[PDB]
Design a protein around this ligand. Sequence first.
Ligand code: NAG
Ligand code: NAG
Ligand code: NAG
Ligand code: NAG
Ligand code: NAG
Ligand code: NAG
Ligand code: CL
Ligand code: CL
Ligand code: CL
Lengths: 290, 291
Amino acid sequence: PCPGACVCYNEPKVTTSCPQQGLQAVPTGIPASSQRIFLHGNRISHVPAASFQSCRNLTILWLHSNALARIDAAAFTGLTLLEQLDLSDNAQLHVVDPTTFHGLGHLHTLHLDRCGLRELGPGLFRGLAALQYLYLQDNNLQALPDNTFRDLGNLTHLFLHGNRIPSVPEHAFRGLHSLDRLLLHQNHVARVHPHAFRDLGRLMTLYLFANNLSMLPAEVLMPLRSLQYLRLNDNPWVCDCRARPLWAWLQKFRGSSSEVPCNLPQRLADRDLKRLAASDLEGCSLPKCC
Amino acid sequence: PCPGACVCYNEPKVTTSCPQQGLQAVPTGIPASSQRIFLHGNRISHVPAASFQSCRNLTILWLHSNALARIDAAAFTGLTLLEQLDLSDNAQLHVVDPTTFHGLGHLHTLHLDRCGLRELGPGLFRGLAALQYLYLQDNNLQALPDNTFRDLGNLTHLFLHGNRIPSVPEHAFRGLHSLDRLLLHQNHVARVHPHAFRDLGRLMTLYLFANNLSMLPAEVLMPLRSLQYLRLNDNPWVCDCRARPLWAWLQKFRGSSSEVPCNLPQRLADRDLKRLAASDLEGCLPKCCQA
Ligand SMILES: *[C@@H]1O[C@H](CO)[C@@H](O)[C@H](O)[C@H]1NC(C)=O
Ligand SMILES: *[C@@H]1O[C@H](CO)[C@@H](O)[C@H](O)[C@H]1NC(C)=O
Ligand SMILES: *[C@@H]1O[C@H](CO)[C@@H](O)[C@H](O)[C@H]1NC(C)=O
Ligand SMILES: *[C@@H]1O[C@H](CO)[C@@H](O)[C@H](O)[C@H]1NC(C)=O
Ligand SMILES: *[C@@H]1O[C@H](CO)[C@@H](O)[C@H](O)[C@H]1NC(C)=O
Ligand SMILES: *[C@@H]1O[C@H](CO)[C@@H](O)[C@H](O)[C@H]1NC(C)=O
Ligand SMILES: [Cl-]
Ligand SMILES: [Cl-]
Ligand SMILES: [Cl-]
């Protein structure tokens, strides 16, 4: 029995589709044989505990563009075969309990973008060993703690752009051995730890533009063996003696890199660091070469 | 009498080499029998017209990494057997007279990268039908005029990355029948004419990443029958109905391509267009948006 005004059909998968119905809550009586559930475009404000626990064969769950303000920690109990979870475009969600995604060992894609998330609680992504795509962009994250993605050994795409991340700690990207694309642009990153990119040996794309980086440590880009593309524009780069290690790296980098506009001193304003000669990077708590 | 700043010999070819000498100008008294001249790594600012005109057997001329601000239109007058000319790493050059490379029917490689070239004069690459490599990357090219490489029938490599080229006209690449690699990445390319790749049948590599391409007609990739490597990433792709032709092309293309990440709409942001479904490419000036 199909609930409400939803559409229930069997091919290509058993699907319960209830998009854009003004639903205030998850409808009861969803067929337990459902493999895909589409609840996007509604006004659902909360997801109570075990809202879909009868749908053991559920692989796809869409809840984006709702009015989510609270997701119960046990909301996804019994969904061991879930592969896709779309919770995006829920600007009033703000916080997800760190135990919410536990047990989702088959989860391959997780959409948490534009949800107003303020923090990433410890253990939020624990045990998601099959995760490949993590969308965290356009939130309100003001920190990127260590070991946040420790168990995500299969993650290939991580999107953190459009947040308020102030810095990149040493073990923020630990365990991300399969990461291919890391987009951190449009944040507030004022500093990166010297060994923060240790496990990113397979990273091909790294976006760091539109941040607040004045300098980059020495050999911080050394582990990036597979790096093909690098974006460092729109940053207050200080082009004095401290910029010599980055300048020498950009001359040897056989991949593609963007412009590195200098912000200080006044005479070198809007000058690409890659074009400059080594003689221009002379002079100056302060860096060691000062 | 070899110049004191230079080292002259003739074991492979007659060579007059004076690199990294701080020379203010071209040294006088260069042996006329020279087949290779290396003036790279100095502070030469001007290349007069009477220079090198005696070296009728000159094949290699190294002038990269200098302070070149002006090169006379007849600087390479009697250099008919000149095969390689390296003028790169001269940011203060800016302009090159369109008659500079006339008569160099034996020139195989031409380095003009990192010269601050703001434009490409008409007939600049005229007659250079022996040219195979053309280095124009990392300059300030604000346009790509029609028939710019019309006579470059033997050109295999064309490097045009790091400029500010806003678009690709219909006949910007006419005559490049032998073109093998075409690097147009890191520019301001916003639109490509539907027949811009007409004569690029033997093209294998095409880089268009880091540009301003919101859409790209699938008809422009039809002539590229030899295409093996395509990079379209880092573009403001709009993945709606207008991207359906480009999408169907990526499904049939069995060569290695980069990701085509969607910039708009927001729900498809950072999603690879190749991995999307045709149902995702619906809705919305493009002709499919209005109906
Ligand atoms: C789920 O799939 C299994 C195997 O196909 C089937 O036996 C079961 O009835 C389905 N529905 C459930 C567990 O609700
Ligand atoms: C991670 O990817 C590898 C490579 O395909 C695969 O063998 C493995 O099963 C994946 N891990 C999980 C938990 O799915
Ligand atoms: C970061 O840089 C932006 C410009 O890209 C600037 O508006 C902003 O004030 C900077 N913030 C800090 C903390 O430096
Ligand atoms: C160039 O070479 C030819 C034959 O090797 C020789 O006859 C001629 O004099 C040379 N040109 C000079 C030395 O200017
Ligand atoms: C173009 O190259 C071919 C061989 O690659 C050669 O036979 C031909 O003479 C060249 N054309 C010119 C004008 O030098
Ligand atoms: C990029 O291309 C768009 C056209 O879609 C244009 O509006 C914009 O000004 C361009 N920006 C730059 C920096 O060239
Ligand atoms: Cl708020
Ligand atoms: Cl560049
Ligand atoms: Cl470059």
